[PDB]
Amino acid sequence: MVNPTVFFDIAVDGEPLGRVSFELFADKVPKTAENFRALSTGEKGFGYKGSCFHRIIPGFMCQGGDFTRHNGTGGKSIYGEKFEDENFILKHTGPGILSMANAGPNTNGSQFFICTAKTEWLDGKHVVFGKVKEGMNIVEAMERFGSRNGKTSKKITIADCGQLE
Numbered sequence: 001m002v003n004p005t006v007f008f009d010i011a012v013d014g015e016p017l018g019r020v021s022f023e024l025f026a027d028k029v030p031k032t033a034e035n036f037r038a039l040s041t042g043e044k045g046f047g048y049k050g051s052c053f054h055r056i057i058p059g060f061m062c063q064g065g066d067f068t069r070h071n072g073t074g075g076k077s078i079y080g081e082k083f084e085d086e087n088f089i090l091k092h093t094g095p096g097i098l099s100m101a102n103a104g105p106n107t108n109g110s111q112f113f114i115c116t117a118k119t120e121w122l123d124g125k126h127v128v129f130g131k132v133k134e135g136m137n138i139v140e141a142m143e144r145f146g147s148r149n150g151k152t153s154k155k156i157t158i159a160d161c162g163q164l165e
């Protein structure tokens, strides 16, 4: 089947910035892709809409998905529990790679990061499950609001999100 595409409409201190869309590699990592797809549509009753990118490190990555504690300490999968690292088939090859944050082997929840460079040292530790398809320039615009320690200088939020045809 055809891989799902999801979009995030990003806002900066509540002003619209632009749209970033992702291919999710359901053909390689179906469980991981389905988690992110469902959280992006809100079909389980919760997920990414209204949440923020809480950690952004320019030249490295923009990190989000903590819709429970808003700071890197929370998140929730669609599965009732944190889930396995499905496989490490896909690697951190460059800008645009969408990968799972975690707290150790087999502890995937809802946090993820969009790489803005090649991050090969994360291979085998974080599960890659998608890639920016359109709006990488918007990820680049976002990255500028990050800082050395990851704290953001403006509030970067997913104003809306869902699945495209």
Ligand SMILES: O=C1NS(=O)(=O)c2ccccc21
Pocket: 030, 031
């Ligand atoms: O691809 C899948 N990985 S899974 O075990 O979570 C699962 C459950 C049900 C249907 C499909 C799939």
Ligand SMILES: O=C1NS(=O)(=O)c2ccccc21
Pocket: 030, 031, 034
């Ligand atoms: O239908 C599904 N129920 S499930 O969420 O466990 C799942 C996981 C992956 C792909 C499809 C499906």
Ligand SMILES: O=C1NS(=O)(=O)c2ccccc21
Pocket: 045, 046, 047, 067, 068, 076
């Ligand atoms: O909407 C929700 N229903 S839920 O209690 O499972 C939940 C848990 C955490 C964040 C949001 C939500």
Ligand SMILES: O=C1NS(=O)(=O)c2ccccc21
Pocket: 061, 063, 100, 101, 102, 103, 113
């Ligand atoms: O070491 C890490 N733990 S984490 O999942 O928050 C994370 C996200 C991005 C890059 C590195 C790391």
Ligand SMILES: O=C1NS(=O)(=O)c2ccccc21
Pocket: 095, 096, 132, 133, 134, 135, 136, 137
């Ligand atoms: O320049 C780009 N335009 S894009 O949105 O297709 C994209 C995706 C991934 C890496 C780079 C780029």
